[PDB]
Design a binder for this molecule. Structure first.
Ligand code: SPH
Lengths: 59, 204, 251, 195
C-alpha cells in the first residue's frame, strides 16, 4: 500500500480514482495508514492584519 | 418512474451560528418509497442523482451557502486512533452537523467545518461539483450527479457513493424584526436507476 | 412377602435397596430419560395377598425439552410451569420488557417429531428509545443503536465544558423504554485574565474571553513593540490558557 | 494539473490572529458609513508562498513546482443583502514601489471599479507583468509579483431594517496562459516515522 510514506500518499490522494475526480489536497497531517484520521488544522498561517503588505522599498 | 422521482428530506434550520450539514447518499434515501425497497431486495445498484437544495429568504437577509457533492467522502474520527460508527457518518434522512471547534469522543467524526471532516481545506471543496446559494442572488441550487465509482455497480448499503455538504461561508444575518426562521430543504431524485442481485431483503 | 415388582417399559421402580417386600408395600415407578409420565395414570404397584403384585400399564411416553430461554420473550401461563411437551404441543410466548410484538410473526413454538422446538423467529423485537436529539456545541456518541439496553455518551466540543450527565441508558420505564438521563449542556469555557504589559495597553479589553478569542496589545507612544501583536484563548481539558506571552514594549 | 488550478478556490484573505480556524478566515469585513479612508484588504501576489494563497488549489499545485508563469484570476463576490449597494476599487500594483497607503496611490496601478448589483461577482485579472518568463514559487525580491488592495470607491448604502455589516469572499484561479515546471516535493506534508 502507498499509504505509509507521506509524500507519495499525498500526491496520489489528489485524485479519487487512479486519474478521475480530483480532490482538494490534504491539508492536515496524516496520522496512520488505516484511516484518514487527522487533528484539526488551521486553514492557513496568520499575518499581522487584513491589509498587511510589508514594505520592500526602504533604505 | 417509481424510483426516478424527487424525494424530500427533513429540513434543517440555518441559524446565525450554523457550521453546516452533510448527508451521505444513497443511505439518505434507504426509506424513500420503492427506491429504498428495491435497495433492500437487491445486491447491486446504480443511479445518478438530481440534487435540489432550497433556501428562500427576503432581500433584507444576507448569507451564502456552499452546496457541494463529494465523491468518496471517507470521513475521519475525532479520536486519531480509532474508527467511526455508521451513525457518526449518516443518520439517514437526518443530517449530520459540522462544528465550529474540534470535536472529541469515541467513534465520532472530527466534524470541524474548516477541515470538512476529511483533513482538507474547506475552501478547496470547489473542485467538486458545487453551487452557491447567495440570498441576494438566488434561492436554490441544482446539481446533476451521474454514477461515479471504480466499478459499474455496487451495493448501496455497504458503500456511500457521494456525500452532500451544505456549508455557510457567510453566516446568516438579518435585522431587528425580520424573519428569524430560515430553513434549508434538500430534494433528491435518482436518475437511470438499475438494480441487480435480487434476493431476500437485508435487515439493518 | 412379594418378590420383585413387575417390569414396566421405560420406567424404573424405586426398590430402596431390598428385594423382598412385605404385604401392602407400595412401589412407585419413575420414567426413564427422554420419557414423560402420562397424566391421569397409575405409577405404582402394591403387594397383595398371596405374594402377588397389582397390575400396572405403561404410563411413560415422549416430549421436547423445556423451551430454551429467550431474551426477547417469556412463556405464557400455563406453559411456563409445564415440563410435559409431547410431539405436537404448541406453546405461546409474550414479550419481555424492552421488547414489543412484531405482529406479522407468530409467537408460538411447536414441539416437532424429532423432539425439538420449531425455528425461532423475532416475534418480539427490541423496544426502541426516542431519538437522543442533539447537544449544542457538543456531541452524542451512539455506538450500538438506541434499543432497549443501549448506552450513549456525551461530550463537548473544544472550548466547551459539559454540565450534566455524561452518559445515558435505554432502560424500561413502566409500559415503554426511556432514556435514563437527560441531555447535558456545553457551556463556553472562560480563559484567565490576559496579562497587562509594561508601557503598553490592551485595546478595548473585554470582561470574558472564550475559546479562540483574541486580545490585541498596543505600545504607548515612544515605545517599540517586540512580540506578537495579539494573543488568543486556547482551551484544553476544560481549562483555558492564552496562546503565549504578550509582547514587550521597550523604550 | 492546470485543469485543477483553473478552478476557483476560496482565499483565506482574512488570515488574521484567532480567526485561523473559523470560516471567517474566508470573509473580508465591510460595512456602511464613512470608511473610505480605511482600507478593505491587502496582500502580496505570492500564489505559492504567501499564507493567503499557498494553501489554495492554485497554491497547493504550485508548491509541487519551482517555477510558475501566467495570469491570475481574483474573483470577488459580495455576500450582503440584495438591498445593499456599493462600489469598490480593486487594484493591482506591480512591484518597484511600496504598497499604496491611499486610494489615490492604488488607483494609479492596474485596477477595476466593481459595482455591486444583480451580478454579485467581479473579476480582477492580474496580468503577467514580469521581466522574466517565469517566477519562483518560493518568491524572492527578484521575482516579486506585486500586490492587490481594495478601497471603498463610494461606500455601502443600506435602507432601514438592513444589516450594516457585510462580507466579501475572494476566489483564486489560473488563466488559460498559466504554466508551471520543475517538479519538486511539497513542504506542507511531513512525518517523523513510517505511518
Ligand atoms: C518480484 C517482486 C514483485 C514486487 C511486486 C510489488 C508490487 C505488486 C503489487 C502492485 C500493486 C500496487 C500498485 C500501487 C497502487 C496502490 O497500492 C493503490 N492501490 C493506489 O492508490
Amino acid at each position: 500500500n502507498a499509504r505509509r510514506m507521506v509524500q507519495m500518499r499525498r500526491k496520489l490522494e489528489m485524485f479519487t480514482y487512479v486519474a478521475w475526480v480530483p480532490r482538494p489536497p490534504r491539508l492536515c497531517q496524516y496520522k496512520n495508514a488505516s484511516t484518514v484520521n487527522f487533528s484539526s488544522t488551521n486553514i492557513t498561517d496568520k499575518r499581522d492584519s487584513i491589509t498587511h503588505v510589508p514594505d520592500t522599498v526602504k533604505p | 418512474v417509481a424510483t426516478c422521482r424527487f424525494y424530500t428530506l427533513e429540513s434543517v434550520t440555518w441559524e446565525k451560528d450554523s457550521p453546516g450539514w452533510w448527508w451521505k447518499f444513497p443511505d439518505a434515501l434507504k426509506d424513500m418509497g420503492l427506491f429504498g425497497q428495491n435497495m433492500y431486495y437487491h445486491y447491486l445498484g446504480r443511479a445518478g442523482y438530481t440534487i435540489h437544495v432550497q433556501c428562500n429568504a427576503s432581500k433584507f437577509h444576507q448569507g451564502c451557502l456552499l452546496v457541494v457533492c463529494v465523491p468518496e467522502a471517507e470521513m475521519g474520527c475525532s479520536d486519531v486512533g480509532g474508527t467511526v460508527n455508521e451513525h457518526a457518518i449518516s443518520e439517514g434522512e437526518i443530517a449530520k452537523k459540522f462544528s465550529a471547534t474540534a470535536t472529541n469522543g469515541a467513534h465520532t467524526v472530527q466534524s470541524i467545518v474548516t477541515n470538512a471532516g476529511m483533513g482538507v481545506g474547506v475552501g478547496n471543496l470547489t473542485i467538486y461539483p458545487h453551487q452557491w446559494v447567495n440570498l441576494r442572488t438566488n434561492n436554490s441550487a441544482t446539481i446533476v450527479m451521474p454514477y461515479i465509482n471504480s466499478v459499474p455497480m455496487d451495493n448501496m448499503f455497504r458503500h456511500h457513493n457521494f456525500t452532500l455538504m451544505i456549508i455557510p461561508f457567510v453566516s446568516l444575518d438579518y435585522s431587528s424584526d425580520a424573519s428569524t426562521y430560515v430553513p434549508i430543504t434538500v430534494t433528491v431524485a435518482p436518475m437511470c436507476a438499475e438494480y441487480n442481485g435480487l434476493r431476500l431483503a437485508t435487515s439493518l | 412377602d412379594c418378590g420383585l415388582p413387575p417390569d414396566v417399559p421405560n420406567a424404573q421402580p424405586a426398590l430402596e435397596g431390598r428385594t423382598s417386600f412385605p404385604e401392602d408395600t407400595v412401589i412407585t415407578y419413575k420414567c426413564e430419560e427422554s420419557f414423560v409420565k402420562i397424566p391421569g395414570e397409575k405409577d405404582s404397584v402394591i403387594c397383595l395377598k398371596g405374594s402377588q403384585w397389582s397390575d400396572i400399564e405403561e404410563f411413560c411416553n415422549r416430549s421436547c425439552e423445556v423451551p430454551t430461554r429467550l431474551n426477547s420473550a417469556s412463556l405464557k401461563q400455563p406453559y411456563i410451569t409445564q415440563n410435559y411437551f409431547p410431539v405436537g404441543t404448541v406453546v405461546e410466548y409474550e414479550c419481555r420488557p424492552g421488547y414489543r410484538r412484531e405482529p406479522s410473526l407468530s409467537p408460538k413454538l411447536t414441539c416437532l417429531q424429532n423432539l425439538k422446538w420449531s425455528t425461532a423467529v423475532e416475534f418480539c423485537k427490541k423496544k426502541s428509545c426516542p431519538n437522543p436529539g442533539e447537544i449544542r456545541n457538543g456531541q452524542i456518541d451512539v455506538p450500538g443503536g438506541i434499543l432497549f439496553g443501549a448506552t450513549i455518551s456525551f461530550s463537548c466540543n473544544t472550548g466547551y465544558k459539559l454540565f450534566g450527565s455524561t452518559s445515558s441508558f435505554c432502560l424500561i420505564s413502566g409500559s415503554s423504554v426511556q432514556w435514563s438521563d437527560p441531555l447535558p449542556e456545553c457551556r463556553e469555557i472562560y480563559c484567565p485574565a490576559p496579562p497587562q504589559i509594561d508601557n503598553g495597553i490592551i485595546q478595548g479589553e473585554r470582561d470574558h474571553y472564550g475559546y479562540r478569542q483574541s486580545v490585541t496589545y498596543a505600545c504607548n507612544k515612544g515605545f517599540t513593540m517586540i512580540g506578537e501583536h495579539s494573543i488568543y484563548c486556547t482551551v484544553n481539558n476544560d481549562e483555558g490558557e492564552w496562546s503565549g506571552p504578550p509582547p514587550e514594549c521597550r523604550g | 494539473l492546470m485543469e485543477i488550478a483553473e478552478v476557483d478556490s476560496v482565499v483565506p484573505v482574512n488570515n488574521v490572529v484567532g480567526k485561523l480556524d473559523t470560516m471567517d478566515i474566508f470573509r473580508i469585513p465591510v460595512q456602511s458609513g464613512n470608511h473610505q479612508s480605511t482600507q478593505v484588504f491587502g496582500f502580496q501576489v505570492q500564489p505559492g508562498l504567501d499564507s493567503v494563497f499557498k494553501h489554495t488549489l492554485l497554491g497547493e499545485i504550485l508548491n509541487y513546482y519551482a517555477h510558475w508563469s501566467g495570469s491570475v484570476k481574483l474573483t470577488f463576490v459580495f455576500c450582503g443583502s440584495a438591498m445593499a449597494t456599493g462600489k469598490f476599487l480593486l487594484a493591482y500594483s506591480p512591484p518597484g514601489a511600496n504598497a499604496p497607503k491611499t486610494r489615490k496611490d492604488a488607483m494609479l496601478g492596474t485596477h477595476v471599479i466593481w459595482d455591486v448589483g444583480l451580478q454579485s461577482s467581479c473579476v480582477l485579472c492580474i496580468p503577467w507583468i514580469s521581466q522574466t518568463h517565469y517566477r519562483l514559487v518560493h518568491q524572492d525580491e527578484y521575482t516579486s509579483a506585486g500586490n492587490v488592495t481594495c478601497w471603498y470607491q463610494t461606500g455601502i448604502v443600506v435602507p432601514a431594517g438592513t444589516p450594516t455589516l457585510c462580507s466579501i469572499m475572494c476566489f483564486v484561479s489560473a488563466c488559460n496562459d498559466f504554466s508551471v515546471r520543475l517538479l519538486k516535493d511539497t513542504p506542507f506534508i511531513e512525518q517523523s516515522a513510517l505511518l
